[PDB]
Amino acid sequence: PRWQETAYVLGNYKTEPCKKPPRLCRQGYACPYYHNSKDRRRSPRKHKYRSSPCPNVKHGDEWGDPGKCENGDACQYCHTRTEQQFHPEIYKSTKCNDMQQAGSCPRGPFCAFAHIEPPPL
RNA sequence: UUAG
Ligand SMILES: [Zn+2]
Ligand SMILES: [Zn+2]
Ligand SMILES: [Zn+2]
Numbered sequence A: 001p002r003w004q005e006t007a008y009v010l011g012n013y014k015t016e017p018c019k020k021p022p023r024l025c026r027q028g029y030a031c032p033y034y035h036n037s038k039d040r041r042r043s044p045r046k047h048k049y050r051s052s053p054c055p056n057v058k059h060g061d062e063w064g065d066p067g068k069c070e071n072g073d074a075c076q077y078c079h080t081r082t083e084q085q086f087h088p089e090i091y092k093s094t095k096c097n098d099m100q101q102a103g104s105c106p107r108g109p110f111c112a113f114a115h116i117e118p119p120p121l
Numbered sequence B: 001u002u003a004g
Helices: A006-012 A081-085 A097-102
Strands: none
16 A cells, blocks of 8 residues: 555565466566565564575575575575665665666665655645 | 665
């Protein structure tokens, strides 16, 4: 429901699974629900984990299967890129480059980077 | 250790 506000994105983005499994979903940032394990995000309200990647999952530059961390959902490290990008300490912390260049961002309300200060009224 |  409240996807248009950043506070809700923070609390809920890819916390839950997409109703529709067909390929109609662009299967990425455009859908606020998760489609696989590598897309999944533990809600930071239920699970307290650090911004840093779990090295049992992230080997170098590749995010791998989050299973194969023997810690499971109790791991105090991020298990997916989504978990990191939308971490309370990471989210909107850095200027969105696409917005700074073009004046528009394709990821829109699901960009994990900062856009421009909105006016209040 | 943010660039999907
Ligand atoms: Zn979906
Ligand atoms: Zn782990
Ligand atoms: Zn953006």
